[PDB]
Design a protein around this ligand. Structure first.
Ligand SMILES: CC(=O)N[C@@H](Cc1ccc(F)cc1)[C@H](O)CN[C@H]1CC2(CCC2)Oc2ncc(CC(C)(C)C)cc21
Length: 365
């Protein structure tokens, strides 16, 4: 799968993109890779921020669906016209498929000024597609029309970022140790269940329901580890305590201020999420280093932040790990990334099995 290794580019805070082609003849575009949504959408008009855009008039294979589509994210909304056309990933599998494409014709605080991407690839399930679940998501179309296995994996490497999207398989060269899998609780977002949390090794004795209210998801289109309220205060409480030996401003834990050195790494704790495992009463844990939740912006940004719609395991989480979206078996795999920025002293980690009871009662119903 070395054809696909290192096919992801980006800039810190601006997402990860892959090169795609649309229409005949092929128009090359950079497309943000987003496991947190299920629309395939590309700029189709000359918005001043865009390096390029989809020009339907140039395409033999374009077909109008004569439906409008609207999509608001956490922030950012766009509106568009649905169509289908032929699509390829040059540094991906050797195929071409007909896919739904939203030609973005109006947007609001969506495109990033200074970014080098022109669209977004929603990789999650139909259930959350707009206007509705009859709009077959890209990856569903990819699997139905080719012999590409129903699986993709992400090694997000973390001012320029790099990484790999392996479509249809796994590249064992992108990780060390063993993959550990957690069930996809439901096929809409990539929903999982967190069952326990630990800073430097200390539990938080919270009802595990507080971790998955109203959901926990794996989202590559989100930068931060985003915890619910209770959970966020508790974890800074614990990190501020473990790291107290150097005084840090309040702006820095709000993610406003910066720290600058010429970096006492082991001043800072590891953070640990236990995930529901494959077997009744068995879990595993994933552990991130300071080198993960501290975003280089020799200065650093605290990258854990409060949330509101559930836990979101964003690039802060995913940059420590190789993440396998095993859609065929309703599960997501985590393994230590071979590219994660580590340490002579420490590493990010994933280990098990652990015994943890009542893992069902952990997710909101
Ligand atoms: C930070 C952010 O919102 N990133 C988005 C993609 C994105 C948007 C703009 C941008 F400039 C870069 C990436 C992700 O798609 C967010 N993913 C989840 C993340 C959550 C779900 C829990 C937090 O909020 C979302 N709300 C709406 C959508 C779109 C929908 C059509 C599926 C309802 C998705 C999400």
């Amino acid at each position: 799968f070395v054809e696909m290794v290192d096919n992801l580019r980006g800039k810190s805070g601006q997402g990860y993109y892959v090169e795609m082609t649309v229409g005949s003849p092929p128009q090359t575009l950079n497309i943000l890779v987003d496991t947190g949504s299920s629309n395939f959408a590309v700029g189709a008009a000359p918005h001043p921020f865009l390096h390029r855009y989809y020009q339907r008039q140039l395409s033999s294979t374009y077909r109008d669906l004569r439906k409008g589509v609207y999509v608001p994210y956490t922030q950012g909304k766009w509106e568009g016209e649905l169509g289908t056309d032929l699509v390829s990933i040059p540094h991906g599998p050797n195929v071409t498929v007909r896919a739904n494409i939203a030609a973005i014709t109006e947007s609001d605080k969506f495109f990033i000024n200074g970014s080098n991407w022109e669209g977004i690839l929603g990789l999650a399930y139909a259930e959350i597609a707009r206007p509705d679940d009859s709009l077959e998501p890209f990856f569903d179309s990819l699997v139905k029309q080719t012999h590409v296995p129903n699986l993709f994996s992400l090694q997000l490497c973390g001012a320029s970022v790099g990484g790999s999207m392996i479509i249809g398989g796994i590249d064992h060269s992108l990780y060390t140790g063993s993959l550990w899998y957690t069930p996809i609780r439901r096929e809409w977002y990539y929903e999982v269940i967190i069952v326990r949390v630990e800073i430097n090794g200390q539990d938080l004795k919270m009802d595990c329901k507080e971790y998955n209210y109203d959901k926990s998801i794996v989202d590559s289109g989100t930068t931060n580890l985003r915890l619910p309220k209770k959970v966020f205060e508790a974890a800074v409480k614990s990190i501020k305590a473990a790291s107290s030996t150097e005084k840090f401003p309040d702006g820095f834990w709000l993610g406003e201020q910066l720290v600058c050195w010429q970096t006492p790494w082991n001043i800072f704790p590891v953070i640990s999420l236990y995930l529901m495992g494959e077997v009744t009463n068995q879990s595993f844990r994933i552990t991130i280093l300071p080198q993960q939740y501290l975003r280089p912006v020799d200065c650093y940004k605290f990258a854990i932040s409060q949330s509101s719609t559930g836990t979101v395991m964003g690039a802060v989480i995913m940059e420590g790990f190789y993440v396998v979206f095993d859609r065929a078996r309703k599960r997501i795999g985590f393994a230590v990334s071979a590219c994660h920025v580590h340490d002579e002293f420490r590493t990010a980690a994933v280990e098990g099995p652990f015994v943890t009871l009542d893992m069902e009662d952990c997710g909101y119903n």
